[model samples]
Target: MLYDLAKKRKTVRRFKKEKPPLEDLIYSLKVANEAPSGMNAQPWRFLIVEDEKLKGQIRRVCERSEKTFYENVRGRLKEWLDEKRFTWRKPFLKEAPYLLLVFSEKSAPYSRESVWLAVGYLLLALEEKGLGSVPYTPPDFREVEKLVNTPSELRLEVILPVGYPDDPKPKYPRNEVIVRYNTF
Candidate 1:
């Protein structure tokens, strides 16, 4: 069952209008919060944006920054973005029922490792609950951090847009990217 669910998970770009219940998201977060941390610091925080107005503002700022990245970043990356059909405009950032921002309290290696695991747990939980989610991060996330009033101590890691998928796109096959034990 777990493997099947993981296989079915995919990035959902379009979302239904129905807003996800807060309790449901809280349950998923509870699952995520259980993820292990180094030195038991658990130095991570979550900022969930459920209000439409806040979502709109975030979308605007993020889009502006994304556009700047495309214009200024190296050429090969822009081509890859084009190949993937990614645009500077990010409507899903606001259309999704929730925008979950993960922040790390310290930039230490252990703190990042712990938060990443927690985020992985949250994504899986969301999938198991019949919801769709994707990790999104704009190039100018610093601007977003400032805009959202994020505490100075925390550094943004990822932003998750969660909702019921409007369109279910097929997932690509998993590549043989994993290495065997003691082998490359």
Candidate 2:
């Protein structure tokens, strides 16, 4: 069942206007909190943003950062984005019913790894709950951090726009020999 769910999960960009149940979001966070950490530090923190004004402000910050990123990116990554018809304008930040902001405590040992592990669990839990989201990280977070008044010790990891998916799921190609045993 876990494999099935993992296979079914896709990076959803566009989402429906309809909002998902609050309890589902809460449940997903609970599942994320169960992830293991170094010495059980549990450095991950989840912030759910549902306020209209706050979402709009966040979107502004993200788009501004994206604009700078797109301008500077070149080579393979730039080509990929161009091929996918991706732009620096990120409207989903405001369109989605909820935005889940994940943060990691800087003082905690193995904090980055622990928070990312929790994010993996959170993604699967969102899929199980029929909620769609994509992990979107901007080029800069200081502006957004100031907007949210996040503590200096905590660093923003990713922003997930949560809602019911609106677009048709697209299939992605994978390498055939992904798994290799002891030798390369």
Candidate 3:
């Protein structure tokens, strides 16, 4: 049942206007923190943003960094990026009611994989609750860290825009990604 639900779940970018309840977000994070970590250290921090002004500020910073990457950083992939309609502006940032940020210590041993497992758990939990979300990692996370007042030691791994979906979209075919055990 849950496996079927997981197959149908999509990374929804467009969300409905209604805001998700604070309690639900907290409970989701609690479930997410259950993910295993190296040595059980569990080096993950979560931050939620519901303030409109703060969300706008984050969008501005995110767009600036995206422009730099779109222009200078990804030189050969310009046409592909254009075909995808990828742009610096993130209007969804302001449209969504919540911006869930996940942070991991930059110096912590084996933190990247641990924190990502936590993120996967968070996403799955959101879907299980009938909520929609999409990963929106800011390009300039240092700016976000300062704005969110996250401790200097932590760096953001991803941001999840959590809310209800505006409309249903087609999912990518799972068959394209199937891999066989011990066979490439």
Give me the candidate number with maximum lDDT: 2
Error of 3 at 59 (Å): 0.7
Candidates, ranked, lDDT? 2, 1, 3
Q: Is candidate 1 or candidate 2 better by TM-score?
A: 2
Please tell me which predicted candidate would have the highest TM-score against the true structure.
Answer: 2
Question: Candidate 2, 184: how far from true, in Å?
Answer: 4.1
Tens-digit per-residue lDDT, 47-140, candidate 2:
8999989999999999998998999989999999898778899888999999999999999999999999999999999999999998989778
- Stretches of model 1 off by over 4 angstroms after superposition: 73-76, 107-109
Clashing pairs in 3: none
Check candidate 1 and list the clashing pairs.
none
Which consecutive 10 residues in model 1 have the weakest lDDT in total? 168-177
Better of 1 and 3 by lDDT: 1
lDDT against the true structure, each candidate: 0.84, 0.89, 0.82
Q: lDDT at 136 for candidate 1?
A: 92
Please tell me which model should have the higher lDDT, number 1 or number 2.
2
